[PDB]
Design an enzyme around this catalytic site. Sequence first.
Site, PDB file in Angstrom:
ATOM      1  N   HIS A   1      23.618  20.410   4.730  1.00 45.94           N
ATOM      2  CA  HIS A   1      22.174  20.430   4.548  1.00 45.94           C
ATOM      3  C   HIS A   1      21.766  21.595   3.653  1.00 45.94           C
ATOM      4  O   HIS A   1      22.447  22.622   3.579  1.00 45.94           O
ATOM      5  CB  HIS A   1      21.466  20.526   5.900  1.00 45.94           C
ATOM      6  CG  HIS A   1      21.417  19.230   6.651  1.00 45.94           C
ATOM      7  ND1 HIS A   1      21.612  18.009   6.042  1.00 45.94           N
ATOM      8  CD2 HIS A   1      21.194  18.966   7.959  1.00 45.94           C
ATOM      9  CE1 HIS A   1      21.511  17.049   6.943  1.00 45.94           C
ATOM     10  NE2 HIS A   1      21.258  17.603   8.115  1.00 45.94           N
TER      11      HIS A   1
ATOM     12  N   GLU B   1      29.115  29.133   0.082  1.00 48.93           N
ATOM     13  CA  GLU B   1      30.475  29.421   0.520  1.00 48.93           C
ATOM     14  C   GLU B   1      31.519  28.700  -0.322  1.00 48.93           C
ATOM     15  O   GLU B   1      32.664  29.161  -0.398  1.00 48.93           O
ATOM     16  CB  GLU B   1      30.633  29.039   1.991  1.00 48.93           C
ATOM     17  CG  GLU B   1      29.783  29.859   2.946  1.00 48.93           C
ATOM     18  CD  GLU B   1      28.429  29.245   3.222  1.00 48.93           C
ATOM     19  OE1 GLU B   1      28.053  28.289   2.517  1.00 48.93           O
ATOM     20  OE2 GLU B   1      27.740  29.711   4.153  1.00 48.93           O
TER      21      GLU B   1
END
Lengths: 365, 367
Positions: free
Chosen positions: B245, B298
């Site tokens: 998300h 990330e």
Amino acid sequence: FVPGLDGVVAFTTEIAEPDKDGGALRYRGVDIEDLVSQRVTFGDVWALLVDGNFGSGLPPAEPFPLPIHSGDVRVDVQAGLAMLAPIWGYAPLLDIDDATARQQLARASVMALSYVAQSARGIYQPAVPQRIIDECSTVTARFMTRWQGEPDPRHIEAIDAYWVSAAEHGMNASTFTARVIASTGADVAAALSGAIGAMSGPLHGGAPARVLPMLDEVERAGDARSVVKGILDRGEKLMGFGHRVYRAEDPRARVLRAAAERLGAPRYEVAVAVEQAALSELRERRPDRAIETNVEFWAAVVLDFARVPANMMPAMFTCGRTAGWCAHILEQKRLGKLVRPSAIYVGPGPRSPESVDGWERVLTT
Amino acid sequence: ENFVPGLDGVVAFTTEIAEPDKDGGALRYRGVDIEDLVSQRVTFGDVWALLVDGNFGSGLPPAEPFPLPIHSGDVRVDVQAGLAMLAPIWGYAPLLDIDDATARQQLARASVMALSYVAQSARGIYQPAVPQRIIDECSTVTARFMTRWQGEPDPRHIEAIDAYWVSAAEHGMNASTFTARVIASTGADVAAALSGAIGAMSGPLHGGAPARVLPMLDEVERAGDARSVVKGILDRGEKLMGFGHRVYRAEDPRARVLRAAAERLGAPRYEVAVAVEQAALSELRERRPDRAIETNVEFWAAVVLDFARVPANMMPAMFTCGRTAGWCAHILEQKRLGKLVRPSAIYVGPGPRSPESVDGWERVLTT
């Protein structure tokens, strides 16, 4: 808007209830006065808070000479506990089950106790042979033997009675810190190590009150009322006493005073006289405010009775609180929700780096 | 029914340090966009000063010689334990007993020693230490770090770490920044707050924790087709690393900075990485069409650090090094705030009961 999350609820817990208006402290629904009167050792009280039931008491610490010699016992355990993860293979909390985290918490908790006793004994004298430690039957007796070598059995009962009374007390900075780190899924050693740093803060509270100099100024005088009435006159704050915490007498303060009486602490009379004199002098000058004995007052008396120096007493408080930390880390793991609060920006608006003060002395690579 | 676990959405503090404008799709440090700091190529030592001081001027100092006193086998554990020992050796008094300038100087001194400790822990015990005279030849703090660690680092990898540390320097009230302020709110020394913040950083659930996407990138380079690999992980009901998300309204601006860094610096794994990103976003936005799905920061943090020869076990410590800027800025702000953080908890456990009524009571030895 009040900053610092003051007054907000962060979690629901089943570990322990500090029933302040009820005048009682309960571990998993068990009054600490029952635990002390029935002589339940810290190793068993550790398991109650952590597991929610009795049985799997804290195990003996394995041999592990403390690798940290920083001069600060707090720094020694904070850094030593964090180092347990790679050598013992502590995986992140996200990747292990509840039972693995429980043993890893119990293994590291009793090792924190071993590290404190070793750092207190010091590097300038030989270690107590493990064979003598094996003769002890409880964690408290093992801790006192590891530290003092030849500990008094009465001093062991005093430490045991103190650790259970200080094992857990709701939400605080160190308990909160351990839960935040555990909420990230980090290994239990990283959570416990981070909680040590929060406990080291002078504003954390709960550490034994520095009342030993006041008790010394009385033993060289003769009357406790004259000294405590004199300290309040010269503008110095009276230690170990203040605003009420529980509705009346703190239940932990009662079990520690009863322990100092039953075990025959030599400074019991001067401590009792200081209690009744400080409560009388403070309640008279401030009839508006409630005044009771801080549990940290009787904590310092019990710890001094067990030959704990003042600079070591914060480490003694940290040792007992390990039970509450471990229980909250395990409960936070089962919760499985990252603690992520928010912050509202009130700083400068969008601006170029050239408009920032001091840009002229900046060198771009 | 007013309690939400995890303190989600609640406001703990106000801050003047930085604004992660999630609505505007941009991250700003004291008003300065991170894309402006990267394009104009401001080094991490200066960005540290900007976040901490609110302006440039007093850059991060070169670290003093201090051979790493701990070797635990984990780069994160080494800097966490090592930072905590800076207090009794350097005379770090609690935050309550020191002034802002003392805390400012102590936070900068420990931040650069955290970088030095990580570089030494990554170099390993099987390698002799790089002499200080070689480190003294560098011009920026990021260069001294790469030199202390690698000896003769690729200048392209120095740019990659410089762009990564500024992109990861600060991001609001994440768990590590929150932990540093909580420990600072107790008045403990700055080393105890930094050491505690590293523990929260080690967690896999931490925001920005570089994802283990290297196995996935190895399979795509081996198989040669990113789509089928990504298609298979979701067809098997497994999670896709580095995607989910949205964080910002659209793309994370930090993900844009890192992807652009891997492009212009010639990262060998970029072509496979963008092929994975394209295949991941295409497949996810098709199975879940009405959902806002974006590339996690990330993902590219993993590509950029791997480009700079950072192993996966070093990656939490590499984020730790860059986040020292936000930690120290928030520790200083927490110090000026001068108020303990006091959350509360509601008891919902068992009522008063006897010890004998507790299960397992007969396993307890007494007297």
